[PDB]
Structures are given as C-alpha cells and as structure tokens.
Symmetry: C4
Subunit: 345 residues, 4 copies
C-alpha cells in the first residue's frame, strides 16, 4: 500500500541561511532583550546554559542568573545534591534557577526535592520527548504541582509541540541531534536540521501560546540571532558556556594551553544502551561574563540591522535567504591570515 | 531524434538525509529486529557480511550466524575449497550460511558443490546484475534446484528488480558504486546514490513480495537504520566488518598500530587470486572481535527504532519519513567544534 | 497572525555563477572601461580602493586616480588630518579623490573640512545604510551642499536603493557581510550573498538612473567582471589592494615571506585608534599597485571580449549567468596540478 | 529596458552526475569504440591528445594514431617546424595527424604549410571560438581548401555550434574553462560547466550532422564515458596524457618521485615561447601512452557494458544521468580506506 518511506522536503540549519537587513530606526543599544521563557517566567536576556555535567552546576547557574539568563542544574547527581545546588542558587539573592528531570523511577521524588528547594522551573528532557513516557510524565508532574513551570524536550516536529502542550507543558525544547558533542544523528540516523526544526515548532507554539527553546548547535552570536528570529523564546547552549571558569571541572593546561573538558551526557564518560555523545576538550574561554557580553552585543547588532526593538518585532520581521557552500565561504572571514584574537570569532 | 541523453532527477545517499522522529510508544530495548532475508530464511538481525576475500570465510560466517546475521562466503577459491568452507560453517551447529556464485562456465559445478555442502542461499554476484547472464543464470539454477534460495545482484533500478524477480530470484542485492573500496563510478561513470537506489528498488520489490538487500557504502550504525527505513530487508557491509578478528588476513603492524588488509574484489590484488580494475587495496584499523562491533550496530538500530516509534522493521518502513540536509546540515549532524580525546566506540 | 519568519529564496555569491560566452565581434584590446560613478563623475576604470586604515590614504588615493580609478580616504583619523590627506591628492594634479564620512556627532564638521579641501565625492559609510541616520544624513548634506556628490552605503536590498535615492544619494554602495575581513554575518547573522545583492540593487538603481557600487568579497579579476555584468558601475576592494606598496603600513616578513597587515574597520584594533564585526590579520605583499591594476584590467577586458561587450553597459545588457555546483567550482579553478610558478593573477 | 543580467539555470560538470545502469545483453569485450571525428575521418577509439606544447608534438601524435586516436600538433612553434612535425607523423606510415591553427595574421600561411605536409585535419583553436575572427577564418580556409577537414573552437553554447557550422566547420570543439590548467573562469569569470556544455552542444550538433568534441576537465576514464554518453564524438585530454613519456618535455624526478612539467598555453611560460589564462606546474610521471590508453579504454568498455551499448551511438541514445550531491560524490570515490597499493586507473 502507500505505506512506505517518504522524502518530505529539504530542511535547513543556521549556517544555511542569512537574515536580510530591514530599514531601521533603532540602534543596537536601544533594543530590549527581555523574553518570556514561560508565561510566569521572564528573562532579561534570552540565554540558558545546558543541563550537562560539564556546563551547569550552582556556580554556573548563579552567574547565568546575574547576567539575566538562567541555568538548568544537571541531574547527573543524587537527588539531594541537586536540591542542594538549587538551594545554593536561590540563597544567592533569589536568583532564577532551573533543574533537569529525567523520565525515571525516582522522577517524582526528584521533582519533590527540587520543588522543596524552590526551583523556579523543571526541565523534563529525554533523548525523545515525543514519547509516551514524557507525555505521561508531564501530566503526572502537573497533576501534583499545577503551578510548577515545566519545560519538556527534546522534540523536533510541530505535532510534538501540540502533543506536549496538551500534556500540560508550559514550554517545549527543540533539538534532536544538533549538539556539538551529539552523535544521535550518526548512531541512530534521526534528527531535523535545527533552523527548520525551530521555525516549524515555534510557528505551532505560537498558535497555542506555548514558547519554544532553541537547544543545541549554536556556535556564534549570529546563530542565536537566527534562532530567535526563527521564533525561539530562548537559546540553550553547552559548548559556548563549557569553556568558562564558571562551568564545573577544573581548567587543565596541556602543552602550555588551557582547556576545559566538555562531554555529551550520552557519552560513555557521563554515563559511568549505546552511547549517543562524545567527550573531548575545548579551549578555556575565561569568565562567563565576558562571553555573555559578546553574545548580547551580537544579538543587539542583529536586531539593529533588522529594525527590531524587541524580540517579538525580530520574529515578525525576519526574512531569511538560503546561501550555498560558496556563500558560506563568503560569510566567514576568508583569504586572510588572522593573527589577533577576536573576542567573538 | 528524441534519442538523446537525459538528466532524470537528483539522487541521494545516506549522508543526504535524516529520519524524522515520530510519536513513540516503544523504548529501544522493546523492539524486534527480525527480518525475512527470503520468504524461506529468517535472520535474527538484518546484517550480512560481504562476500569478499578480506571479509567473509568460515570464521567470519560462523560468528555472523551466531549473532543472528549471515555471512556470504566468497568465491575467490577453488570449488572444493569453497564447499569445504561452507561445510565448516554448517557443521558448527546448523548455522545459516551463504556462498557467492559467478556467471561463469564452471557456474553449475560451483553451485552443485555448495548445495551438496548444505548451503542455505547462493548469491549470484555480478558487477552488473541487470544483464542477460544473470537473468539466464538464475533460471538455470532455479530449474535444477527449485528449492535453493537465490539472491541476485547487484542492481540499482526498479526495472532490474522486476526482471530479476521474473527470472526467479528470491531476493535482489542493491548497490552499484557505493562501496568504500569501489571505483566503479570513477572508472565506468556508472552508479546510483545508494539511498535513492534502495528506496526505488524496495518499492518495486514490495509490489512483488521480493526483498532487497542494501549492499555497500554503510559506514555508521545510523546509515543501516536509514537503509532499513528505506525498505531494505537487510544490510550488507564489508568495511564495517573487515577490521574484525574473524575476517581473513593476518594482522599487520605499521609504526606500532594494528591494521588488517581490506580490498575490493575488483582490485588488482583480488583479481590475481582482461578487465580494468574497479576497486582499491588498503589497510583498515583492527576492530577487535566481531561481537563488539555487532553490539554497537544493534544498539544503534534499536535506538533509531525507538525514535521512530517502530516495534517491527516493517513498522519502521511504513512510518519512515526522510528529510534532506545540506552540506552544512551534515556538519551540524556530526560532532563539531570539539577536540575528541576519549574513543567513542560507535563513532 | 501571518507575522513570522519566512525563507524567501536562495541567494548567490560570485563563486556560485559563471558568465556564458556570447557571439563576439570585439577583442579584449578594443573594449572601453569608462564608467560613470555618479552622473557627474566619470572614471576611466571601474575600480575603487576601500576606505580602510590599511588600504587608502593619500598615497593609495594618488596611485588609484593616476590609474583611472579612485580612492576613498578613510576616516579613522582627525578631521584636519583627513582634510589634509584629501588636499594632498587634489594638489597632485587634477586627481579625483573621495573621503568617507560617518553618522557622527561631528558629521557636518567633517564634511565641511573635506569639501574645503576640494573632495570630489563623499561616502556616507555605515554598517547599516538602510537606516534613519544615514537617510537624514544624506538629506542634510545635500541640503547644505547640493552639488556635492554623495555615495551612501552600505545596503543590500532594492528598498534600500530606493530610500537612499529619494534621500538624495548620487550612488549607493552594496555589501553587507561579504568582506574578506568581515564577521557581520557570524556576529549578527545578517547579510545577503553579494552577487544576488548587486543584481537586485542594480536593477532597482537602473529604474532611478542611480548607479550602485559592488563593495566587498572580490578576490579575483573574474569576480569583478561578474560584479559589473550584474550591473554595478564600479567595484570596491580592500583585500585586493591591501597588499600593495601604496597602501598604508610597512611590509612585514614572517618565515621568509612578505606581508602587509589588513584589518576590518570594525575590528578591535581599528576601533582602538560595541562588539567587533571584523578581524585583523596579514595578507601577501603584492608589490606596487600598478602591476595589480594591470592584471585586473586585463582580466576585465578579457571577460568583455568573451561576452562581445565593447562598453560596460553592453556587458550588463548581454550578461547571462549559470549557477555552478561545488563540483563545478572545483572544475573552474586549476585542478589536479601541483602549481610551481606564481602567476600574476592567480593565488 | 529588460536588458539586464539574468541567471539562466544550474549547469553541471562531470562530477555532478552518474550514469544509470541499463538492462544489458553486451559485455565490455563485445562493444565497439569506433567514432566519426568528422564525416570523413573515423577513429578506432574516441580519444584525442590536446594541442599543447607539453602534450602533443610528432612523438605524441605518432603514438596516439597507432593506438587508434589522434594527436593535434600544437602551434607554439614556427610554421616550418609545425609542417615538419606533421610531416614526421605522415611518413611514419601514413598515421592520422591534426595540427592547431590560430586566428593570426599568418594563419593562411600556416594552413598552407600543414596541408602540403598532408595533414588530415585542422583545428582552428582560439580562446573564444564564437567570434568574428573564427567564423571568418573558417570561411576563408574552406573557400581555399574545400575538402580540408576543419574543427573549430572553443565554444560552449548551441548558438556557437550553429554559427560555426554555417561557416563550414566539420566538427566543433566544446570547452570554455574546464581545463586542469585553466584560469579563464577565475580571471575572466566566463565559462559553462562541461557536462551541460557538451550535452547542449551535441544536441545542437545532431540537428546539423556536425559532431562535437569534449575538450578539457576529464580526469578519469569514467568522465570520458559521461562525455560520450552526453553526445561528444571524441574526448580531448591534456592532463591525462601530459604525464606520459610521449608528451614533449623530459622526465624529471624529485625525492624519488618522477614527474613532468605541464602548463596552460595561456600561462606565462608558454606565451614566452594580454594577462595569462593558465598556470604552470608538475604532474606525476605515468609511463608510456600505451599503458594509459589501455586503462581509459577498459573503463569506457566497462561503462558501455553497464549501459548495454554495443556502440557509441547506442550509448548516447540510452544514456540517463542522475545528479548527485556533495555527499554522493564522497560515496562515489573510495572512502574510509588507507590505500596501500596504487591502482592503474585511480590515484
Ligand atoms: C542513554 C543515551 C545514550 N541514549 C538514549 O537514551 N537513546 C534513546 C532513548 C530513547 C529513545 Cl525512544 C531512543 C533513543 C542518551 C543519554 C543521554 C542523552 C541522550 C540524548 N540523545 N540526548 O539528546 C541519549
Ligand atoms: C572484473 C571487474 C574489475 N569488473 C567488471 O567485471 N566489470 C564489468 C562487468 C560486466 C559489465 Cl556488463 C560491466 C562491467 C570486477 C571484478 C569484481 C567485482 C567487480 C564489481 N564492480 N562488483 O560490484 C568488478
Ligand atoms: C562599530 C561596528 C563594530 N559595528 C556596528 O556599527 N554595528 C552596527 C551598527 C548599526 C546597526 Cl543598526 C547594527 C550594527 C562597526 C565598525 C566599523 C564597521 C562596521 C561594519 N560592519 N561596516 O560594514 C561595524
Ligand atoms: C592570450 C590568452 C592568455 N588569452 C586570450 O587570448 N584571451 C581572450 C582572447 C579573445 C577573447 Cl574575445 C577573450 C579572451 C590565451 C592564450 C592561449 C590560450 C588561451 C585560452 N584561454 N584558451 O582556451 C588564452
Ligand atoms: O549526549 C548527548 N547526546 C545528544 N545530545 C546531547 C547530549 N548531551 C547534550 N546534548 C544536547 O546538546 C545540547 C548542547 O549542544 P551544544 O550547545 O551544541 O554544545 C544540550 O543542551 C543537549 O540538548
Ligand atoms: O572491487 C569492487 N568494486 C566495486 N564494488 C565492490 C568491489 N568489491 C566489493 N564491492 C562491493 O562493495 C561492497 C563492500 O561495501 P563496503 O561496506 O562499503 O566496504 C561489497 O558488498 C560489494 O557489493
Ligand atoms: O570591520 C568590518 N566589518 C564588516 N565589513 C567591513 C569591515 N571593514 C570593512 N568592511 C567592508 O569590507 C570591504 C572590503 O572587503 P574586501 O575587498 O573583501 O576585503 C570594505 O570596503 C567595507 O565595505
Ligand atoms: O592556458 C590555457 N587556458 C585555458 N585553457 C587552456 C589553456 N591551455 C590549454 N587549455 C585547454 O585545456 C585543455 C586541457 O584540459 P585538461 O585535460 O583538463 O588538462 C586543452 O585541450 C585546452 O582546450
Ligand atoms: K565575511
Ligand atoms: K579550470
Ligand atoms: Mg576567574
């Protein structure tokens, strides 16, 4: 019968597209970066640190919150260690704080402890958010804690946005495969290029009043611009934050150069089922505050180019063009022996 | 006249596409990997070791069958030598076994011997399966041994699926050019990118009740998933298995590292054990025992079937939707902007 | 509502396209390269040196004018210093000179000084040309100096051409993100591949009788040919001229080879003299401007010969592009040859 | 007006495409490679060596003729020397011989000399063949020698095929910018990807009974199959033949590896014997012509087996191309193999 594999379309990631400049009466230092992570939760800047054991513990979540973003404490620890980490962030001046929850046996026990520590939002994320286990997990949590803010992921299709919204999620996280340390697309063959994924999911989210998060695959400040212009309410990153002194792990020096170890939570190292992540070393980047300053400067630039004083205006006025490989070469610095370090390239 | 060359379409290979997640009720450890290699032969996993002199002999084929797959013992040996390798596998517990056959004038005598040795399926293996020799060779074999199971190949179009099924083949092997050791596309200009060829051939084979094998160019566990979602009943690999301890060939040490020889059957070297070569010779990293390699493959497939909500291989096919990515989406899919230090065992 | 992000089309850069040869009655030595930079300023060759502190000061602007083109004195210096740079050009004969102007608190003060120093054209130069500040800046400058020739940039859309034209610009400069040293596309995600931007803008400009400049991203002479065939009246280059002796800066030697420093005006170092939108580095030292210009002019004249165009307007009216793939791109540059002699116009 | 630049289409080169296998009744040892270079000149194999001073003088033309092809003696030498080169080939047993002619003030004198030496075919060779000079030159030549076989080029559009045919060309040479040593597309921005060029032009040639030659950009035997399947009567190669002992220039050796010099006729080096339109470098020494021809022919015969073509006309009338991505390209070459043994037809 007609039941058979189909090739549906071409899907794009951030490097495939550029934003067209609009006429503008706004300069970069006049724009506002506030966003609604959920209906109840507002962020001053639309950035989140990933809930990985190499990216976000309390030290990182504290620095994120004071920069106007938010950090999701990772769940690769005891329930009580994670509640202690959430309690350390909240005791640092009432800062926003998130906590990652997995679909497990102790899932409700973990939620209780991070709820007792007064976590502001829990992220129920799985390899595959469009599942029975996640859907039934969100219903279970919201039945107990109707006011607790719940982000569910990861997903990559508007049907999954709709299904996760019917389950009670207050926000939905987008990204199957784009992770810099992710091999899910290589080992299972599954994933959606992240620009198409975010655009289609945000469009459906907008129909329902449910925001979407662009999770994974972001390398430069410009990628973040594209993701918010595609419709994400916020951008979540591991690689971009994992080289920072505030992320867990010590700054190791090898051959006179400083490194931090960054790894996927599906890697063999994090899990000490077939691995879906790798483990490696990135260059130490310094303090989170200097990275955030370049990221925020890049976003304010992009909105100035597009004439958008708010993130809503950026979405409603974003037009992409697709570029080829040859346009990719043109869009990056070329035919130049770059010497001096650039703080955002 | 209108008789002139044409550009028909764009054709895709595995790295061109990704599978879209589906709403899923089933977890990876719940799924069934069982498949029908032919109407009469079931495999416990849909994996097959290629019929090459650097991949499959009796040690490789025994290990494959023990893991739920099957090995096709190669023909680069005398007839009695190939019959004895088959019977070495069949005397190891009745394990399933295969043997490749060529379009030759000693063809029936080679078939005679492997069948007496209780082979389970022969593979009529030609550079060009959609040809008069293969079609007529399948008929002769089926007329002398109507029960014997015949895979025919290699081919790349639906018309070839149809002509080989009319000729009596129980299964057709798809793949012209994709092999890691293959220069057919470079020296003859001829091939079909493997994902489009599998999709097109599987669609015809399902109208006829004839399975198709995806042979060649598989590099990663996820590629197998795409080849199965595209409609193949099984995947056949050389490169993925050729480093394993149970492949023929001595371990070779170069500058303190371990490698095994891996070479195309159309390479100058394989042909000595006259036509221009259509393969290369080289060394491949030693991959340990076969078991370690199949484990990762199997886990990667199961992972893919959870992502698509598929408890059968059939269900995976009826619900598989592919999305095309660019070279930049390819760069996003693989790990990027990290200096990998520890070894990832399925990457 | 319908208010959301859209993907409009695919846009192309110079390396995506090739010009198709036309039937031709003219050989390269017969074509004319004269161009109208504005309806008041004629250039003998359609080439400009960018307004960067590593490309154009008095010395480069003098050499460019003498070759038939023009230089734009940069503005990373005091007002009196830039006016003094302009006057030295104007005092070296009847020589054309340009000067760049920012949207600054002292904009009119800087315009007054270069006008008093007899500048021929000013370039109102910003990262984002389609902007209130540039539009009102053009209107003020043209209200005070109605005869002064004003170029306004940088922009990348027909709507920007039209709004700059109605604000009074005599010419608009096209290029958002294609510069060799630019990171605008990486840092802001914003840009338009330069071939599509030049074609779209030049078509709009031609309806108004306002010309456009192709600024940035030009690496080879053939790139300039495609920029002019797409409708630009002139081509602006930083990288191509920044290795020349006439550019500012000393020659540097590293590991036995000659270089010059080259850096974007939005780089950290340029602004030392807001997050950066350019990088800083070194390019090969190319020798004197005269030999580089000879190569560029020769390549342009050869392009017009292939296209049967004795004038630049004829080039535009007869230009036809095909899109090439990645594989075509490798066909177009020398391939499968270990190049051993330096050619004056390649690598 | 509507007179403006246009983007006509996407155009393909050989690596963009693969040929689809056809049902075949013919094996590679059963096909025939005979071809008509013009109405009067038959070739036993469809191969020509390029008219360059690193590829073809009398030594190369003698060896090509003996192999069944033809060599085009270059014109970067005096009129008398080129006649004697042609004469040396004709007195080696009446072997087939061509000679190159340019659009020069002495072109009829050059034609006179090589005709007296009994050349079989003239190549009016010029950077841009779709030009008054070449149209008028072919008219002058055919008026004085109505029976002299005349090839003219180089061109890249069906319009050019028509215009040269009306002028009396017996065969047309297709290729603008695809040569291994060509920089025309880089310095002038002008060219057409070679597969599209040959397909369009051959189709136009077939309406006229005028054949086309695929000149340039061929790297493997498989590329020749695509060029003939696209409708070229013959393939012309520089790079593939410049490494042989029979090409002019000595066999050098550096660090144990032997090599020859190879350069464009538009390179600085060749012209000292307008800005350059080629590069100069070195390629691997390949040995004697006979060993290279054998591989090329085996590859072509293999391709025709795959496509079921007993003849080149059959190949053309049954050729169906599929377009492949960048990722299809990597699947098509060998991949993930450390090649240890050099193959006669792949490196
Ligand atoms: C455990 C492991 C290695 N794999 C899976 O759990 N696979 C998987 C799960 C459910 C289904 Cl239905 C299909 C596949 C993992 C661990 C941590 C994170 C991920 C990950 N891919 N995040 O995005 C994966
Ligand atoms: C012998 C050789 C080098 N080539 C051919 O037999 N060519 C070939 C055969 C028939 C036709 Cl009609 C066209 C071409 C070979 C040997 C072993 C395997 C292969 C191979 N490509 N298998 O997939 C090829
Ligand atoms: C200062 C800096 C770094 N950036 C901006 O001014 N950004 C910017 C300005 C306005 C708007 Cl609305 C959006 C972004 C700069 C300096 C010199 C040249 C450039 C450059 N990209 N020219 O083309 C940029
Ligand atoms: C001399 C030189 C460098 N260039 C030209 O003569 N250019 C050229 C001639 C006429 C026209 Cl209308 C347009 C361009 C050359 C010499 C030898 C071969 C070639 C070459 N590209 N052959 O294919 C070119
Ligand atoms: O092991 C893994 N496999 C797949 N995805 C992962 C894994 N670990 C983290 N991720 C995802 O990748 C994101 C980080 O991606 P990055 O910003 O590109 O480095 C995280 O927020 C997770 O969503
Ligand atoms: O010499 C050859 N030329 C072309 N194809 C070959 C040759 N040898 C083996 N093959 C095919 O390529 C496959 C090996 O695939 P691999 O897994 O990509 O290494 C085998 O299953 C054969 O179908
Ligand atoms: O810092 C920068 N950021 C972005 N664009 C720049 C910057 N500096 C110069 N440009 C542009 O790049 C052009 C030079 O480009 P190039 O010829 O490709 O090197 C200049 O004329 C400017 O239009
Ligand atoms: O200097 C040059 N510029 C451009 N094309 C050239 C030049 N010299 C030779 N050619 C062409 O390139 C062809 C050789 O192509 P190849 O086989 O790819 O090396 C010759 O047949 C000529 O048509
Ligand atoms: K750039
Ligand atoms: K070339
Ligand atoms: Mg510190």
């Amino acid at each position: 019968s007609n039941a058979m594999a189909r090739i549906l379309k071409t899907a794009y990631t951030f490097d495939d597209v550029l934003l067209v400049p609009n006429k503008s009466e706004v300069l970069p230092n006049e724009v506002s970066l506030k966003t609604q992570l959920t209906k109840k939760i507002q962020l001053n800047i639309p950035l989140m640190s990933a809930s990985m054991d190499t990216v976000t513990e309390s030290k990182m979540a504290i620095a994120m919150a004071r920069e106007g973003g938010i950090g999701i404490i990772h769940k690769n620890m005891t329930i009580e260690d994670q509640a202690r980490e959430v309690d350390r962030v909240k005791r640092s001046g009432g800062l926003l704080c998130g906590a990652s929850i997995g679909v497990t046996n102790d899932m409700m026990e973990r939620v209780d402890a991070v709820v007792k520590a007064k976590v502001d939002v829990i992220v129920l994320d799985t390899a595959h958010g469009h599942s029975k286990g996640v859907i039934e997990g969100v219903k279970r949590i919201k039945a107990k804690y109707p006011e607790l803010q719940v982000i569910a992921g990861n997903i990559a299709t508007p049907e999954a946005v709709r299904d996760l919204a019917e389950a009670g999620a207050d926000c939905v996280k987008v990204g199957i495969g784009p992770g810099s340390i992710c091999t899910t697309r290589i080992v299972a063959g599954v994933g959606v290029p992240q620009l198409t994924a975010v655009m289609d999911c945000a469009e459906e989210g907008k129909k329902l009043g449910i925001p979407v998060i662009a999770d994974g695959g972001l390398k430069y400040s410009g990628d973040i611009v594209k993701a918010l212009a595609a419709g994400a309410c916020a951008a979540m990153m591991g690689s971009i934050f994992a080289g920072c002194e505030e992320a867990p792990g010590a700054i190791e020096i090898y051959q006179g150069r400083s490194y931090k170890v960054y790894r996927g939570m599906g890697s063999l190292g994090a899990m000490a089922f077939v691995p879906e992540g790798v483990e490696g070393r990135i260059a130490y980047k310094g303090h989170l505050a200097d990275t955030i300053y370049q990221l925020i400067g890049g976003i304010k630039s992009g909105m100035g180019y597009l004439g958008a004083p708010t993130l809503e205006n950026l979405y409603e006025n974003a037009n992409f063009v697709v570029q080829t490989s040859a346009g990719f070469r043109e869009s990056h610095p070329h035919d130049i022996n770059i010497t001096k370090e650039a703080p955002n390239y």
